[PDB]
Amino acid sequence: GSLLTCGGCQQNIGDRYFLKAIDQYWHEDCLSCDLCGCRLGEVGRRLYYKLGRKLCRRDYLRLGGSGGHMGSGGDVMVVGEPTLMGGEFGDEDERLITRLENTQFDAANGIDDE
């Protein structure tokens, strides 16, 4: 039933896996980005968010940072590589949420629990 509550849909996390870090709990497909429209970086480490926004550093950099361009990343030769392309970098200290498991991870119904 109801174990944790996600801050994205707030419909409770009865899943087997779940994500959390900001200050509350989330969902795997709920914890998305605000403005870039990506999916941060689900490699548990640090996290980047504002007072009341789960907005990226690059998102924050797009309006109140130093970017606001198309070419994102570090200024390096364009060979078709991730991150390093322009100026609005990536993560490292960004929303690297910890992909955790639920206490009732059981999963009595496959990708659905009781």
Tell me which residues touch Zn ion (CB under 5 A): 6, 8-9, 27, 30, 33, 35-36, 56, 59
Tokens of 1: 């039933």
Contact of 93 with 6, CB cutoff 8 Å? no
For Zn ion, the closer CB: 36 or 100: 36
- The letter for the amino acid at 18 is F
Nearer to Zn ion (CB atom), residue 55 or residue 114: 55
Nearest approach, Cβ of residue 114 and Zn ion (Å): 18
Between residues 9 and 76, which has the closer beta carbon with respect to Zn ion? 9
Q: Which of 53/74 has CB closer to Zn ion?
A: 53
Nearest distance from C-beta of residue 79 to Zn ion, angstroms: 24
Tell me the β-bridge partners of 88.
72
Question: Cβ 77 to Zn ion, closest distance in Å?
Answer: 25
Q: How far is the CB of 30 from Zn ion (least distance, A)?
A: 3
